Design a protein around this nucleic acid. Sequence first.
DNA 1: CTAGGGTCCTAGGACC
DNA 2: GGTCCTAGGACCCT
Length: 342
Amino acid sequence: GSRKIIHVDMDCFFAAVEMRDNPALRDIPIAIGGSRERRGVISTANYPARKFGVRSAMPTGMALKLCPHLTLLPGRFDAYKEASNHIREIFSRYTSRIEPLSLDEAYLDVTDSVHCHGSATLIAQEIRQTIFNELQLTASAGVAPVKFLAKIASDMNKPNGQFVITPAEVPAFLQTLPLAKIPGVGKVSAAKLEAMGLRTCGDVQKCDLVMLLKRFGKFGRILWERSQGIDERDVNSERLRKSVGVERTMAEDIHHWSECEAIIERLYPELERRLAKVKPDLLIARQGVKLKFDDFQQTTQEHVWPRLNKADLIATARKTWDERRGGRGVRLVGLHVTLLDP
DNA sequence: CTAGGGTCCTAGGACC
DNA sequence: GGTCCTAGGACCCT
Ligand SMILES: [Mg+2]
Ligand SMILES: [Mg+2]
Ligand SMILES: [Mg+2]
């Protein structure tokens, strides 16, 4: 009853597209991200920049101190969406069991596939080669019997490589696998788990489910299961977007409501244009706003509302501005919408 | 020196 | 007791 799951993951996705499209960037350290003046962060970087320590989510000021010659690009999201569409169409040549997780990655269930004599190893290889040939971008893959292991596997032998975990191999693999490598166990949880002597899945196997449940809720069950290779989540392929949001961090904190309102007036046409691509009538389930203060606390207020409406978004921003700003400056304003259910 | 795009879980009170 | 409404926050991707 063993399934074959493939995880495919593009290498340095945004950066790889910039190099393909401008070969002058191939061998110098580059990065997509907001500028230091914009108070931005690094979205991604190429391997010459990562050599210096540059990583995704790093403040750009830190990126520039580690790598003073970093060339900073603003990002061409239509070019990335284009490549993303193409790889998903390449996935569809092999199976309809495709669950994308972001622009540049997807799960595939090829258990019932007849390509490559049913070899999931050979299918992943054909997909990576077919992605290089037609997009001039490279990809890595992971093959495993369950989702999370296949996704860990695709990280292990990148760039432009893959890694296979057979059922016979998973107990040795799990025994020293750091918990933090499981998708969904993040920095906070890893630090909690560390602080009680739990670092690897091997550690968690020595733990009682009842204890983990009390101490972590449903998260504890997930921990207990993943630590034994248990991950029965199906590859979906029918998932749908539930919300759309637009927000901007200003280069300077704002302190006056006129400033906040001026910002909303520019965010709103962008939110409308994007909602309209998916919902021409703008019919929604909820709409709302987001403020991030200078103590980095963040608040949102959203409410039931039937149709994208700009003045209600301003009025809600007004209450939030008065009722819970407490004289702090504000570094970010955001608009938000929750999509109807079907 | 801290983005912007998202998903999902938790939790309390309202409402049934 | 279910389900909805709302807020917050961990986490994912680049
Ligand atoms: Mg990637
Ligand atoms: Mg990815
Ligand atoms: Mg990444």
